[PDB]
Amino acid sequence: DWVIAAISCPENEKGEFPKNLVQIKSNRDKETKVFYSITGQGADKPPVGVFIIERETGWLKVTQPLDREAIAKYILYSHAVSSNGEAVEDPMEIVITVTDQNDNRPEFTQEVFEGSVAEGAVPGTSVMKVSATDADDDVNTYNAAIAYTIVSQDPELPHKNMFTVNRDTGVISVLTSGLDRESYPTYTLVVQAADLQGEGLSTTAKAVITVKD
Amino acid sequence: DWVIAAISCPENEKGEFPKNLVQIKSNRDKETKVFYSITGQGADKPPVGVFIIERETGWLKVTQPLDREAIAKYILYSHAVSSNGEAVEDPMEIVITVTDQNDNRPEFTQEVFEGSVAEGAVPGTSVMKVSATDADDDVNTYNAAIAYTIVSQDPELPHKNMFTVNRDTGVISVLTSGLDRESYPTYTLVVQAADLQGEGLSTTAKAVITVKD
Ligand SMILES: [Ca+2]
Ligand SMILES: [Ca+2]
Ligand SMILES: [Ca+2]
Ligand SMILES: [Ca+2]
Ligand SMILES: [Ca+2]
Ligand SMILES: [Ca+2]
Numbered sequence: 277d278w279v280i281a282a283i284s285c286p287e288n289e290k291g292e293f294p295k296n297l298v299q300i301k302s303n304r305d306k307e308t309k310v311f312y313s314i315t316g317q318g319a320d321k322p323p324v325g326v327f328i329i330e331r332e333t334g335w336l337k338v339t340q341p342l343d344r345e346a347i348a349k350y351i352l353y354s355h356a357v358s359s360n361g362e363a364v365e366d367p368m369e370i371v372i373t374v375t376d377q378n379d380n381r382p383e384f385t386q387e388v389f390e391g392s393v394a395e396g397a398v399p400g401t402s403v404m405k406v407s408a409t410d411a412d413d414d415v416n417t418y419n420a421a422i423a424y425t426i427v428s429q430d431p432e433l434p435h436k437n438m439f440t441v442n443r444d445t446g447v448i449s450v451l452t453s454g455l456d457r458e459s460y461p462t463y464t465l466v467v468q469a470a471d472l473q474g475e476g477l478s479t480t481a482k483a484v485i486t487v488k489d
Numbered sequence: 490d491w492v493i494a495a496i497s498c499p500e501n502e503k504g505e506f507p508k509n510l511v512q513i514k515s516n517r518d519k520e521t522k523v524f525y526s527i528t529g530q531g532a533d534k535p536p537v538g539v540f541i542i543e544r545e546t547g548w549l550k551v552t553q554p555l556d557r558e559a560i561a562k563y564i565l566y567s568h569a570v571s572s573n574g575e576a577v578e579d580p581m582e583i584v585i586t587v588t589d590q591n592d593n594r595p596e597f598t599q600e601v602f603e604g605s606v607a608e609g610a611v612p613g614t615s616v617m618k619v620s621a622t623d624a625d626d627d628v629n630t631y632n633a634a635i636a637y638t639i640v641s642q643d644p645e646l647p648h649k650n651m652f653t654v655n656r657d658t659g660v661i662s663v664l665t666s667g668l669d670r671e672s673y674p675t676y677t678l679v680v681q682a683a684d685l686q687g688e689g690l691s692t693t694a695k696a697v698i699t700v701k702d
Pocket of ligand 4 (some may be wrong): 555559672
C-alpha cells in the first residue's frame with residue numbers, strides 16, 4: 277500500500293492555526309458520500325487533537341505549534357467511511373515529521389570541570405576537557421554544532437592567557453610559559469559553548485585548573 | 490482508492506528550488522527495493538519536469554515557480570516498481586493546486602467608454618458604466634476585487650466634480666447641477682480601477698460623456 281512517508285512541518289510555527297497540511301479523499305466518493313477521520317497519537321490518542329481532518333473535505337490540518345524535541349514524528353492513519361457506515365478504503369498511513377529550529381541553548385555537562393597540570397609543562401600540553409550538549413538537530417542543521425571558547429581567566433597572572441581551548445573538542449591546553457604552583461596554584465576559567473558554530477545561543481561553565489609540581 | 494486531492498503551493502515562490510512537497514512510499518519496500526516515478530502534465534508530459542520525484546526516497550518536489558493564471562492544478566500519478574521490474578502498487582493520483590498571489594493588474598474592457606446625458610438631468614441621474622476585469626482569484630481572495638474611482642475631469646467647468654462613480658459597479662452618475670450643452674458639450678473623465686478593494690494594483694481608462702439637449 278501507499279504511505280505518506282512525510283509531510284514536514286517546522287516546529288514552533290507562528291501565525292494562524294489551524295494550518296492545512298494536505299487534502300486526502302477516497303475516489304469512491306462518486307458512488308456514495310464519504311466521511312473522513314484520522315487515528316493515532318496526535319489525533320484521537322495523546323496528544324489529542326494536535327492533528328484534525330475535516331470530515332467532509334478530507335483537509336488534514338495541524339492545530340498548534342509542534343516541538344521537535346518532544347515529538348519529532350507522528351504516525352496517523354486516515355479512514356474513509358460511507359454514509360451507510362461501511363469503510364470504503366483500507367486505512368492509509370500518514371507520517372508528519374517535525375523539522376528543527378534553534379530553540380535550545382547548549383548545556384555544559386558539569387557546572388565546574390576540574391583539571392590539573394604540571395608547572396613545567398611545555399606550551400601545547402593538553403590539560404583537561406570541557407564538554408557540552410545541545411538538544412537541537414545535529415544531523416540536519418548546525419543548531420547543535422558547538423564551538424568552545426575561553427571567556428576569562430582568574431587570576432590574570434603571570435599572563436592573561438595562560439591557556440587555550442580547542443574550538444571543536446573542548447580540550448584545554450597550556451598556551452604559554454610561566455605557570456608556577458608557588459605563585460598561583462589555581463586558575464578559574466569561564467568557558468563558553470555556543471551553537472551555530474559559535475555564532476548562536478550560548479552558555480558558560482567554569483574550568484578550575486590546579487597547578488602541580 | 491485514496492487520492493491526494495490537494496497539496497497547495499503558492500504561485501511565484503522565491504528562494505531555492507527544487508522544493509519538497511511530500512514524501513510517498515510503498516510499504517512493500519520491506520519485501521524488495523522499490524523505485525518511484527511520476528506521470529502527468531507537469532511531470533513526464535508538458536510542462537515537462539516542473540514536478541519530479543526522487544527515485545529512491547519518494548520525495549516529490551517542485552522545480553520552478555508556478556503560475557495560477559497559466560496552470561492552477563496539476564494531476565500527477567505516482568508509480569512504484571520493484572528492482573525486478575514489477576509494479577508493486579496501483580498508481581496513486583496526486584493533485585497539486587496553485588494558490589493565488591496578486592500579480593495581475595485590473596484591465597478596463599475598453600480604452601475609451603462613451604456615454605451621454607441630457608443637460609437637464611437631475612443630480613443622481615445614471616449616465617453610463619465603465620467596467621474592468623482582473624485575472625486573479627476572485628473566489629478565494631480580494632486580489633480581483635475592483636473599486637472604481639474618478640481621477641480627473643476635463644474641463645473642470647462649470648464645476649470640478651460634475652459626476653461621480655459607484656465604487657463597486659462602475660456606474661457613473663450626475664453629481665451636481667450645471668451641465669449645459671452650449672457651454673461644455675463634452676467631458677473626458679479619467680477613471681481608475683484598483684484591486685484589493687481599491688488599495689492595490691491599478692489601471693486607468695477614459696469615459697467621454699456627451700451632453701445633449
Ligand atoms: Ca523545540
Ligand atoms: Ca541549539
Ligand atoms: Ca529545536
Ligand atoms: Ca500568475
Ligand atoms: Ca489583481
Ligand atoms: Ca495571481
